[PDB]
Design an enzyme around this catalytic site. Structure first.
Site, PDB file in Angstrom:
ATOM      1  N   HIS A   1      -2.284  -1.195   7.993  1.00 28.83           N
ATOM      2  CA  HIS A   1      -1.325  -1.474   9.046  1.00 28.83           C
ATOM      3  C   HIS A   1      -1.029  -0.236   9.883  1.00 28.83           C
ATOM      4  CE1 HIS A   1      -0.194  -5.634   8.123  1.00 28.83           C
ATOM      5  NE2 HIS A   1      -0.390  -5.312   6.859  1.00 28.83           N
TER       6      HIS A   1
ATOM      7  N   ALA B   1       0.832  -1.198   0.000  1.00 26.41           N
ATOM      8  CA  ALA B   1       0.000   0.000   0.000  1.00 26.41           C
ATOM      9  C   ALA B   1       0.868   1.250   0.000  1.00 26.41           C
ATOM     10  CB  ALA B   1      -0.935   0.014   1.205  1.00 26.41           C
TER      11      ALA B   1
ATOM     12  N   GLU C   1      -3.900 -11.243  -1.736  1.00 27.99           N
ATOM     13  CA  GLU C   1      -2.970 -11.430  -0.620  1.00 27.99           C
ATOM     14  C   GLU C   1      -3.541 -12.406   0.387  1.00 27.99           C
ATOM     15  OE1 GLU C   1      -1.685  -7.664   0.968  1.00 27.99           O
ATOM     16  OE2 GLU C   1      -0.621  -7.244  -0.914  1.00 27.99           O
TER      17      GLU C   1
HETATM   18  C1  LIG Z   1       3.694  -5.720   2.591  1.00 27.63           C
HETATM   19  C2  LIG Z   1       2.577  -6.731   2.490  1.00 27.63           C
HETATM   20  N1  LIG Z   1       2.322  -7.020   1.123  1.00 27.63           N
HETATM   21  P1  LIG Z   1       1.063  -6.039   3.209  1.00 27.63           P
HETATM   22  O1  LIG Z   1       1.476  -5.368   4.585  1.00 27.63           O
HETATM   23  O2  LIG Z   1       0.034  -7.196   3.520  1.00 27.63           O
HETATM   24  C3  LIG Z   1       0.324  -5.011   1.900  1.00 27.63           C
HETATM   25  C4  LIG Z   1      -0.803  -4.141   2.407  1.00 27.63           C
HETATM   26  C5  LIG Z   1      -1.639  -3.697   1.226  1.00 27.63           C
HETATM   27  C6  LIG Z   1      -0.227  -2.932   3.107  1.00 27.63           C
HETATM   28  O3  LIG Z   1       0.825  -2.410   2.658  1.00 27.63           O
HETATM   29  O4  LIG Z   1      -0.830  -2.482   4.112  1.00 27.63           O
HETATM   30 ZN   LIG Z   2      -0.539  -6.730   5.352  1.00 25.81          ZN
END
Ligand SMILES: C[C@H](N)P(=O)(O)C[C@H](C)C(=O)O
Ligand SMILES: [Zn+2]
Ligand SMILES: C[C@@H](CP(=O)(O)[C@@H](C)N)C(=O)O
Ligand SMILES: [Cl-]
Ligand SMILES: [Zn+2]
Lengths: 188, 188
Positions: free
Chosen positions: B95, B88, B153
């Protein structure tokens, strides 16, 4: 940015201290962040020792808020005695300036939060032979608890940079003792 | 505490946003922080499924600067296109509010921090059968990339609480679609 900054219970961080610049550090199975020079030297160390498959970065930068949640968790789960032994007070953790790494073995069941396993291992032995050549010291050695205020932590390494790490390690000093040494020398 | 908050490329966090309450979360091999109710329901879920020895919490709360450094890392290592698929934008990650968990298998060695392995295992299968009963949804399902703007994911779960997670999961919805549904329904 002082790589020699002494941070412990008697020398806590100032609240006006600039939060460190950070980068995502390699050789972990999760996102760990470190001051850029620390990450670079960690990477150099792992590659030069060829320990890529054997060790991993467990913990790096923590905010004060996070250090406080860690402290409160351990207090609750493990009690005050254990927590005082192995967890720095918020404001007193090297992890808050991004110069500390917790290192663990990659083939570990058991693996605990507070005390990652980095003992009884050929890999850890090799790591301990070369660490200091890339700017790292073993921060909390055995039988230095009265000086550091922290019990023996084989997994916790502090970046101080060269030649400091080599000087400290060869004399089997703590960072406390290193500062004592420097102050005594300018005193004489 | 808005457990339903929609955070994505089109809906970034503001700095109207007060930071989340945080607690250290159990069932990880390193320090992971989450909003308290999230950590609580995560713990209940792992205990209920008996997955304490099978899965692990890989990632939780991430500061905005950390998300930026994670994104920049992926850009360097994986290139722009891959990074946009899986990471993201800074300011647009769940997060950053402490309501998202990345979950992996406890046995996996040299796991990917960007895309933790969480398919083709009985543990992941059981987790996918029960997560929604503890307030979690699969945030980025496989046939929803045009809606979420993020690729599939299997490891990424978002806490929305009950009954929302059950409603969303039974409809095979995204949080985006859930928001549109609630909005549409209010006008009735
Ligand atoms: C880094 C991992 N792909 P994530 O933490 O699951 C991606 C998610 C969309 C984010 O960056 O919050
Ligand atoms: Zn994540
Ligand atoms: C004294 C160290 C403890 P540690 O971070 O190595 C342990 C909690 N993983 C600190 O709290 O800074
Ligand atoms: Cl809090
Ligand atoms: Zn440490």
């Amino acid at each position: 940015m002082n790589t020699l900054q002494l941070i412990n219970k008697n020398h806590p961080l100032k609240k006006n201290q600039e939060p460190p610049h950070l980068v995502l550090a390699p050789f972990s199975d999760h996102d760990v962040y470190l001051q850029p020079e620390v990450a670079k030297q960690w990477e150099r160390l792992v590659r030069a020792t060829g320990l890529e498959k054997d060790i991993r970065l467990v913990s790096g930068y923590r905010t004060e808020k996070e250090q406080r949640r860690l402290w409160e968790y351990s207090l609750k789960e493990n009690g005050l005695a254990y927590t005082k032994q192995f967890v720095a007070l918020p404001g007193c953790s090297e992890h808050q300036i991004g110069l500390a790494i917790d290192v663990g073995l990659k083939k570990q069941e058991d693996d605990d939060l507070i005390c990652p396993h980095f003992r009884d291992s050929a890999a850890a032995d090799l790591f301990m032979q070369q660490m200091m050549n890339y700017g790292f010291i073993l921060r909390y050695p055995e039988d230095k608890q009265e000086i550091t205020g922290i019990s023996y932590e084989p997994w916790h390494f502090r970046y101080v940079g060269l030649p400091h790490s080599q000087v400290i390690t060869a004399q089997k000093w703590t960072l406390e003792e290193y500062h004592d040494y420097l102050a005594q020398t300018v005193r004489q």
